[PDB]
Amino acid sequence: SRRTKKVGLTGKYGTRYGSSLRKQIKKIELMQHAKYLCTFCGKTATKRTCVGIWKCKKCKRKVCGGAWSLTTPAAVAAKSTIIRL
Amino acid sequence: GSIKRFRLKQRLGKCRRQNRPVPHWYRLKNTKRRHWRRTKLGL
Amino acid sequence: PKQITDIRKFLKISRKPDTTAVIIMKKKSKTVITKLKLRTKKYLYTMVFADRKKAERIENSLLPSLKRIYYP
Amino acid sequence: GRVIRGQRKGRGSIFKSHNHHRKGAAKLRHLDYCEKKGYIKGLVKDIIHDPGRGAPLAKVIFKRTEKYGKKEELIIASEGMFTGQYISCGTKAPLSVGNILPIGKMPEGTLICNLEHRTGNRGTLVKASGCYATVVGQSEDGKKTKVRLPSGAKKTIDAKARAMVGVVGAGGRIDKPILKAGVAHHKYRVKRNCWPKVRGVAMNPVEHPHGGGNHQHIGHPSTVSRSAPAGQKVGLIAARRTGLLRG
Amino acid sequence: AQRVHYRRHNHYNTKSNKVRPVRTPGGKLTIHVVKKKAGKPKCADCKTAIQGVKALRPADNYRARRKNRTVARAYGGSICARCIRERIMRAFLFEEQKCVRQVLKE
RNA sequence: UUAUCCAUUUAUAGGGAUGAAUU
RNA sequence: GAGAACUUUGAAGACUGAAGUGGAGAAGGGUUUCUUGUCAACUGUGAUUGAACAAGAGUUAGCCGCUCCUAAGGGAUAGCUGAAAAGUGUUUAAAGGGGUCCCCGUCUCAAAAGGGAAACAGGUUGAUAUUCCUGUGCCAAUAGUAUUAUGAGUUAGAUGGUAACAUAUAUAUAAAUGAACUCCUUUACAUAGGCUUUACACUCGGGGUGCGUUUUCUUUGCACUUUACCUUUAUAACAAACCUUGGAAUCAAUUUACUUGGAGAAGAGGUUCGUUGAACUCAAUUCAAAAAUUUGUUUUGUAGCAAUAGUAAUUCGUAAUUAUCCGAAGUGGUAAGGACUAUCCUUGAAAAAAGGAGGGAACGGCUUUGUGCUUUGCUACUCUUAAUACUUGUAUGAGCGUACCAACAACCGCAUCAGGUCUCCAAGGUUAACAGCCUCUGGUUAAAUAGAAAAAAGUAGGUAAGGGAAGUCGGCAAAAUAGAUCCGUAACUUCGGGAAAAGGAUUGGCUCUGAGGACAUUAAUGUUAACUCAGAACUGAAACGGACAAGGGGAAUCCGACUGUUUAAUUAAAACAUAGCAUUGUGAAAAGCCACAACUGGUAUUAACACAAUGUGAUUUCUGCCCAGUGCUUUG
RNA sequence: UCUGAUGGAGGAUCGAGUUGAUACUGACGUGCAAAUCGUUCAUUUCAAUCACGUUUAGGGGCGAAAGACUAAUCGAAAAG
Known about the structure:
Chain B is mainly alpha-helical. In chain B, 40% of the residues lie in helices and 0% in strands. The radius of gyration of chain B is 13 Å and the shape is elongated.
């Protein structure tokens, strides 16, 4: 069934490193490899390709984004201010 | 080695040729002999 | 090596001036036949036959103005 | 004593940048009449990873106007630009994310990247991943514009200087914890030979002023003067203060 | 079990000295080293190889098969089918969308 | 701004209202 | 042979044993190679041997490499410094090519494992062979004319397919024009994981060709049966790419895994690239029905080389013919390919060289007018592949390497030194296994010695009654199970582990038995390929992963979080590093740090999520008071 | 939610080889050897191992730091 109670994909790390270190990478695993939404077809199938490069599973067209999220709040706010003019 | 340069091979041949003894007729009237295993000609 | 049974294309080569060599087998299927071979300057012309009479006819259809030879 | 580790770095034998796989210098388009008096639009064909840096690069094709032909320019990509979009560079370029504009033409409060601190520098400031400067003021007479850099510093740059509109991509890269020595090794393998560090206090006194002793301590104050020579500048150089800050 | 031996003068199994042995009419196992498989030319839109061509090395492609080099069409197979039809379906699209503009500009 | 110094380039257009485009 | 434990031959007993004293290997060596002769010294005993000595001989390339390209980088040029020596290498390139004015552009070296024109088989020598010989190919190159043909297109260039797709089978499938200028592609690239294909490897039973225990049993134990480079071969399936069309929903195709889709799926029809380069009647026919030509049923061929070369058994002048060469499969050991999935604060070379394209400078002829142009008559014409023959130099094919060792005595360790020193291959049995152990081809039976005796002592082991650490600084050393299956598994914990915790049982030997896939007929019955379980017996010296191979556990304390690194030759650790934490400096070519005699340079192909300089050293919880002193730092 | 059902991550584990060198403070210590031999031991998907090429040269280099290494030479190499 559910093999890991709380560790999740950090189970690859065993008991090494701090529990709080793994639990602070906890805030980020469930979204680093996540399938985000592509705005050129509309299927939530974008994948982490490199540090700042992102790709969906349909377009084969690449987007510059965040380190482990497709968009970061800092850039979204800036785009909002620019677009409101 | 099997693969070698022309100058190296010519020098090897010259050093081989310089390793024969004094001719018998001349002796009837040498110190610089090497063995391949004893003294290396340093090339 | 060119396995062939069409007759017109095989008799087409009957004018090529540079074919020289011929090879005669005696192969027993179980029936005595032969697999005649001729010489081609760019491939290895060898014919598999089906009829002994046909093999006999086409080993004489050759113009004999050149060499004769056989491995056996 | 002998020459210390920090002193040997300037010789540049093994401390030169590991740059075998780098894709090229990230530079803005060279200043041209077209860029000086209006938009010129280039198409970003591809977004590449430069092994040294964390910020992805944009391969923008510009069709040259002095001859038949296209020209390839490698520009640090802001967060949001995508393969196939058209990017306008120039005085009359519209103010949108990724466009290259003169600094005095944009309104104030806008976030910018790839800042060029002297006109014609084709990009000098604000280039690390996730970094952005903000336009905090236009001079009343023009020809001068005030920005706030990611360090919090406040700078005045002439209004003709160009910059990219938006923030540098791959933002937040320093957030995830480096779990192990291995990925730090891989990180610095494509940058430099600055890792591992080795404490100067664990060395011998011949190689470091912190070295020596029976108990592995510095022994003398670690705040060194700004005028200290090369083999002496090892502690906290010209430190205005020490200890935890208070905000 | 029989045993092997190399001939090509490059005795390190690099990716240009890949070995395959087959039995010879003499009765013993000799070494046959194959050439390197070469990549295929691709389209610029969605990163796909072009069809109607094969992928010989440059030396062999200097002698390659022409009808298996390019399709006799427009650019010659520079674009895959699903993207060259997209290019077409956009082609006169823009040529209509420009024409409507200067007409409606008055 | 002429001495002097710095940067950029292919020293490549006088100031104001994801398809191409050379002979 | 004067002389034989260590020269040769034959017989035996053994070893190396699939990770080899085996074949090829580079570096290094340099004639140690081969034949003949030979023993003054050497070959730590002998020696007739030899890598010793002496005389001769031996290395054959258009296809194997170098040579070419570029990389980390080296040298140099212009400058600029410097007394020079030297340092640096565009820091005000007046610096080689293209096409026909312009465009482009430092030079040179650096890879015998990176990129790359093109070769295979058989045979041959005392010593060379993918180099020589036989045969069969391949690649690059090839100046001006008169003949030919083929194919095309034409009185400036085709084909269908509702579509994807494909489109010229002459000796060869060449035969669908093209400048400047430009834009792509190939070369060209990481790791991990499994799936799949194919070749090779190995193996299985009944067919063709030989040896054997058999006091006792035997269809008896075993042993010898091939096919290179050369063909998109066609295939075929599957891998993937691609169109009409159903237009799903009571979503569907599917993979080992997830992958995909209303920007097209069930479901249907349809077509290239990628493999292995005989497979499905592939190249035909005997014959039938379709029809101005196809589908099916029968005969030839180890799909085409190909057997005739090579290999093998019995006779036979000492030179030969003989006959076989078959149906199939099964395991997955090694390679390569394919389509995928995953990983990176790591994204995993370049150039020579080749190709494709956009564009449209220039495109049918003979002769004739005036000045490449209008023009008058005729219109057959032009290229692609192969050449034929006269003309320039002679119009193919440089130069270098090629023997042998590669350690076991040919290399480095002063040596013929138990040391050191860069790939592939792998049957059984046993196995999880390229482990260990034994054998099979190949190699060896040699080690600076041999006999005899066999006490002490040494050294490398083995076993010891009863006790079981009483020994000793200290359980040092050795013993103790240790594989697999089933069961069971505590404290503590960062919830991931601890854990093979701890602790049990079985496995022996045999008679057994039973159960778990692909191939077909109108719920059933026939051909043919597993190793997982189970309980009843009995049995055998109450004992069995039988050899080999293979954890000792537990309770705690100290240190270091961990993986890692270190004093080559006395210290491997608690030391170093490490992630994490924190501090400091720096907004740039008038900056921070550092190099340099100067010139100039590294960081820097960089830009505060950066660089530089420190301290501490996972996580958790904390990190108190002191600025007097010494430092550092800021104002006036 | 758990109970069962499907899979291939990790500077994960054992373990040959490779790379080393914990202990016997074994042998040897006029050695096979100016560092070897035997058993035992650590290590094997990565901060991994190896080869060639290449860069850094002596008050210099290089150093996961031992005053380590820089050709049997190192708290300043070797040669004159």
